[PDB]
Design a protein around this nucleic acid. Sequence first.
DNA 1: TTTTTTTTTTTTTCTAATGCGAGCACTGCTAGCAGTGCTCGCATTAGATTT
Lengths: 601, 611, 763
Amino acid sequence: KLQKQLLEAVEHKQLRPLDVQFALTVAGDEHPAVTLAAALLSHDAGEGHVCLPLSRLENHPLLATCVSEIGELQNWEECLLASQAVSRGDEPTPMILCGDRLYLNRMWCNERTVARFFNEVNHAIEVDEALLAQTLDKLFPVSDEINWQKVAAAVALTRRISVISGGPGTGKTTTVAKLLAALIQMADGERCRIRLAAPTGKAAARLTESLGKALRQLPLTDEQKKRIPEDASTLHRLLGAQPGSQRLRHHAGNPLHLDVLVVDEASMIDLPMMSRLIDALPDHARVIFLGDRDQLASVEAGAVLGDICAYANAGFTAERARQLSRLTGTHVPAGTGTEAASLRDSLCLLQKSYRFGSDSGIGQLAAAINRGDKTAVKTVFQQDFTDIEKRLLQSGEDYIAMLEEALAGYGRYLDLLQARAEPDLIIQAFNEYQLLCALREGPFGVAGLNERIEQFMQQKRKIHRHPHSRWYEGRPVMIARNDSALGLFNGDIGIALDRGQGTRVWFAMPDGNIKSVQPSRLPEHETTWAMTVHKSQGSEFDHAALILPSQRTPVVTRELVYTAVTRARRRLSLYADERILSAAIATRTERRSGLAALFSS
Amino acid sequence: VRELELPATGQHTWRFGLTRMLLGYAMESAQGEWQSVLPYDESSGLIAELVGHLASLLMQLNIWRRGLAQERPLEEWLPVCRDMLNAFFLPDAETEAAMTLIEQQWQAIIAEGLGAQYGDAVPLSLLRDELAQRLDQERISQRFLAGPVNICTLMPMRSIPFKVVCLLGMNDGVYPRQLAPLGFDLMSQKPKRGDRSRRDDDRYLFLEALISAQQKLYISYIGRSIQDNSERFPSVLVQELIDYIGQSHYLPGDEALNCDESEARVKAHLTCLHTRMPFDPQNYQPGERQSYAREWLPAASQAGKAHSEFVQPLPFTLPETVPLETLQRFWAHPVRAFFQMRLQVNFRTEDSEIPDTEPFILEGLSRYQINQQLLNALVEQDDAERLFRRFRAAGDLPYGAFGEIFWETQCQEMQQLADRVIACRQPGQSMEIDLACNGVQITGWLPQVQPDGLLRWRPSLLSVAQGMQLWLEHLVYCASGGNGESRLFLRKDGEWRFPPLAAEQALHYLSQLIEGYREGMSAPLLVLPESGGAWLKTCYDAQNDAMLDDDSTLQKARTKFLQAYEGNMMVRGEGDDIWYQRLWRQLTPETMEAIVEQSQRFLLPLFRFNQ
Amino acid sequence: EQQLIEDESLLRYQACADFWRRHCYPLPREIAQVVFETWKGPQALLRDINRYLQGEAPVIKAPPPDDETLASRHAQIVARIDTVKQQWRDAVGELDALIESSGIDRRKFNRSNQAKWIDKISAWAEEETNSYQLPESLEKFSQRFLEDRTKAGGETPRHPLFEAIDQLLAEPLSIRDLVITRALAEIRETVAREKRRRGELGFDDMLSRLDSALRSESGEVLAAAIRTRFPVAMIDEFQDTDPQQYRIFRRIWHHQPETALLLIGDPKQAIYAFRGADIFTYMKARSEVHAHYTLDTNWRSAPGMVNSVNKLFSQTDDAFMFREIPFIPVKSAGKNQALRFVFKGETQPAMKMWLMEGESCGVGDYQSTMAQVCAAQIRDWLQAGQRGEALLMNGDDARPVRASDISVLVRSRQEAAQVRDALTLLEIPSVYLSNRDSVFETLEAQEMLWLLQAVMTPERENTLRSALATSMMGLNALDIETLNNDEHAWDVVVEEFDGYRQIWRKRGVMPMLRALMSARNIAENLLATAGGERRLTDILHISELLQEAGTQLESEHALVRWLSQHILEPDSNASSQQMRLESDKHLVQIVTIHKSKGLEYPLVWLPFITNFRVQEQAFYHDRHSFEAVLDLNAAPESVDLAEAERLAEDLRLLYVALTRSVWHCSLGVAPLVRRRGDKKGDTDVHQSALGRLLQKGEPQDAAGLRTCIEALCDDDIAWQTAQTGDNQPWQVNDVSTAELNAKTLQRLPGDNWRVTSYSGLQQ
DNA sequence: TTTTTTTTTTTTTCTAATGCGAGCACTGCTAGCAGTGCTCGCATTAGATTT
């Protein structure tokens, strides 16, 4: 039957073998339309899409090929639901035909959970408007114009579940500090148990340090400063996720003993972990999320923060606008129309970036890229901006010039190395320049760029290298996994050097102190001359240089370039073809999920 | 399965497991069976792509397993090996040589067959067993005279003069090597001059080795077996050699002695008997027999120090905050706590190997988990048929009617306990415990705290450890402040019942437990809850609230303690444990008395307040 | 080209599982209930027929019909039970009046108990016959039970229902025999088929295949092939002979000319009945041979032991309870007339029986007390021999009693362990020669595994600390505590383990372990520590096995994987995995009676000769046909016939264990009771082999046993009461150690000479 | 074609044999009752090899 035809898709690297096996097993010997539908659904679910609209099943080239075998179907819904492999939820089946879309039974449950949690579960908490306004005025001095931070604080205090979206360097951490301060000051006698979570250990430690330094500055009594959260954890450790099994220490039956929870960097939060977190929350806990919608989406299948903030463009509810105007003591704009009041009110967007001004080339470039207008990006490049640079990379002679520019980029670090300085200054200097590549291997990629840069530092005298040693002084490394013994996290950098006692790697702890580790003691690590855009999330470099390959790959997209641009602090350089950049910015990443339909109905 | 003429079951097969994992990737196990197969929840994320690769292997393993069955002529077997290699293997720089050798041997065998014009079909079992013999027949002698010392077997027609010639493995039966004729050969019946035999070959190689030696000849053989301290014998060749030596020479000063005494003396002077162990001091005494290895010199000299007592007093300061889970995990096993918590030593044993066959009977942790699930379902008055179908789809239960019989027996056994529990069960919620004892603050959570009291149930036999856990929870509940009693209903009508207690007595006993925990964190608290528990059950008298002293009861308590510690052949005792072996390899009466004293002191209130 | 396999357990279990899958699975739930009641699964099912599978198949008495399926037997039993239930239902009212009118003592048969029994039987009869279970009250309502309890000279209640119940309860109802026969056939068939498929072979398979070949049509030719090759053949230890072996020997060498045959054996020494050997086939051979020859004089032991044995076996007539095995007195030789054993200046009697004190003694108490007494006496012998007092003397020549010449003969493994523990409590070196345990089951295997696992990945602190805290390293608790704090020490340890990993990758397995033991001084500390010598020997053996296994395995992780696997499932049958001797010094040799056959020991101990066992299973030999007969039913006739042969085997084992000694043998005697109740009454010593010969096969009390022991006592046989030995460790005088120094190498050997190509020069 | 996490423990045989305790019917002694003979039931304890 269709099995022989599906055997060909594996050869062309269009359909994964997992999808083929899943279709053959579940669809069984039903009509070939069912098998084809199952294979395409499994493929889209592997590629990151949550659902599969039947309109998509209407004429993938494999579907055009199998048109002859499947024939013509007056209604796909009839044929699909007729089989036992698809149902409407009355009986447990692997696939579920929901409305006009297809879901895996696992994905559908999580989708419904997130939907009902964001629609009906959240409630509006009522407090004194005058006291809250007085507290916020004591927190925010300026009342002449609309302060988005004040509106975000008001929203987070009003609603149980609230999300605050904003770009990098927009003052998110400060806003969360003001929020937690006002929250602690509002409830005096009631116990306030604060919890802080992050999907990555590095972001967790950064959150600990930032929230601590922020809360210590704001005036609080010894009572308030005793309710400051001790540390921030990972989402898995918070939920007590066991390594081998999928059993959770805190399941639906055992709720989390929390009053307020703050989850930083929700952009990396995927759908399954989101649902499993929702299942462990009680009915009195208030949850706050942090992240940028335009930031690169999570790895696994799903996109929560993006699909949620998509509705924030509509604006606030009419009555909610007047309510916030009465709270903040200003004039808050009102979104026209009513689509979903709860979700639109639970969302605030920070549109002001204190880090970089509007006149800066970085901000205008990021705005043009987010808008998807290639002519705008080209115009921004043409304009006289001293902090943006572009270099054409087509022939190898331009790759050599890129290496020459990377030389001057790493110049200060290399000089401080060759001058026999202390590791502290060397580590502080190393974070000034960084290369960011999309692919991992090949000509443009971490594995290739590291080798090429090492060969180029061997060709021109910067750092001596021994082939047999593999641990020549000066090489930077980064850790692959988290380690609780050494107190170093995944995605953290270190500098290997010889202070005189021996060749040791120095890491910069969040407390500012430097820690020396033996090369043998180190876990799995890799040379970090160039970083991937994915692993570069959360970090900030003074001078960043992005490298886009000449080829056309589904990895290079709009959000990747947006993150690479927002990664730099002051100076940004790009190496990419004029046409490839425009083609990449013109294509937006979409992950099909019923949330768009669910929140509207 | 049907090909082996065995009844088709449909479970515990590669297809079953694959379908289960795929369903678990598609549907969460919480939903339930779809086609009488429980989805495997573990493989749920992107890692499940591995499954898709594994399912690609087995399919191939299927196809070929059908292709190789039928017999084929020789010319049809030609592309088989190459196709199988390029399908199943992805070559590499090192493996390419082996693949080429396999192809060459296969092609040579089939080429000989085709040159012989064998028409009839040939089964795969013949070519496989021929290739197995042909592949290992190769030998590598390219380093015979590389320059270092030569190690090699005795091969005929290889006679090269050497200064030092050493011979090993001359035990009777190993050398000479005997290869008897096929038995129907006509040559061996009426032999003539020039006929070759392996026996005569080795007998002549032994002479060639002797003649080729220019300076020194060394001969060695195993005299006594190291395992059994038995007696072996040397080869007949070595025997004839030493006989000729002893009959042809005499040591100085033995002229007066006769031939036989001088022969025996020479033979004993030349034969050297080495020690059994390398650290034997005889090896290091000055002489010609003196060794050259200095690593075993300090061991032979007996200059090392014995291992000091592992138990050592360590400084410890009790913090201000101690979670209840810490105390619970400590009192579960006090020595294991000192090992795992204090100095962070964990002895993780290797996991069990995959079972060979599908489950026929259920025992151990599997049946324990099954009984726990069944009990937690019966106490909620849920349908047992749902759980039975779920376990059958999982495949844990035995096939067919035997699974139903086992389920019925377990259902009766658990229904008794479920009725017992429902008799006293009441709606209760969890609570938070914040307490202060001996300047130490305890923070914890207690689940299922009903107004009646602390109700707990487990489908296990009555044991002291569970009673200790319940007693700790009961002291926490009483000291926190509440009117209730503690109950625990274990398998086979086991009952641990504790009446309510005043706040002061609760705080006092909890302070005693905290003091014991601090002492355990300082030094390993030798408290065996099972053996010592048996000792205290024998000695203590509930009627007079005082422990007996008479020596008869003491002997009975010692017998009970030994039976609990060592254990029967069927059930391992409390003494058999990795943690206990570290502290002592053999139980001494002094350690026994210390354990008895500590266990009595700590477990006296448990047996006292148990009703 | 045939292959040899020593252990067939896996193939046998696989065949049993195949039989179970084929037969038990399709069965309906109701017959499955009865099958499950008898056996829980194939694991227990194999346990019953394990012995019967080994060797030749046993003739089954009264075999079921070939065509009778399990369903037919189930229907037959259900029909019988249904008939009984219907007869009870029809007679549910008349029985009361029948019992009341007839004359039977109501003290033995209470009316309340009668009503309860009637109620229970009625409830059972009205119950559907789902299972074969029958109530106990049916035994009370049996005709024989009623006839047993009745008034002397009075009317006895008799009803056809009572006769039917008596006929029913006469024989148990079960599907055991049919399933057992089907399994015994099909599992054997499957094993033979699979072994033919693999082309392998086993001992029993070798013998059976040779026998079948000889019985075949071509075997005659094969017979000549064996006959011409070996004209004369001499079989030793012929008393232990299988029917297959004797059939082969007869087929080959019975009547052909110019071919002699010499059978040498002692029927009193037939002790391998459990292994398949049979005394009945030996007696058949003895009947089939016309000529007989005998040796008169004993050359093994002192004349005291000869007279002792003769007097102990001359107590009764036909001591071995077999008419074809007559005992005759033997005479010592002239060479041994001077043999003596002197202890503390006083010549000890050749044989000494240690009688325990008390009336009723349990098995465990007997074992513990005799172990303690034997340990104490061996300690006293060693103490008296270390000063040159105790001597084994051949005339004027003498020599001290070393710990090697003293042997303790045991029947079972647990017995040997009980002896060895008590003997080691006094710090006396001893070893058990019949130990089949594997090295991997010890803790040293786990410690070496932890060491390897840490060395493989020293980066991980948990595994490193785990391997450090092992007893093999010998660190304390303060050491580990201090090492978990100081970073420098931890770093040095990590560095040394990383260097060990380099050595492991480069030079193999043994070099790494050797360097580790050298640097950590493990061998020195183990030799210093008391008992650590066995630990070091086991560590060395494990190192040798790991080297042998790493030679074949190219991957470094594969060796750890293999070691973990072997630790999980240690193979006791493996000869390589057998534990080596602890030390080459004098060790008390604990050996089983079967492994002591044909050997010789100056001083012998039998702490538990009196201990015996009653055989519950019914397997015997026919007195007429002399054939092995297994009765799958529990008929008491077969049980008694098997118990008689068991007693004969125990008598032969006693003979074998007594004939081992040369100068002195001691042995325990105690009033061992096997029945819990009536301990004050007659003891069960008469059932024991030794007791039957001491008490002339007559039951007696402890006083009677003591009086019989006193009557038997003479100059050669002296008795002494057994008391708790003194808990004093044996003191051994230490020896001063002379100076020890290894040699050095003045001239370094040179590797200059070599043969290389252009590739080697270029590289 | 890109990737984030997390650490802990859970169980243990079964059959058999007896000693005593409670209840009861009979019966002999001085119609009831104490002894006696008996019996069933619950708890307690013992034991399970050898190339």
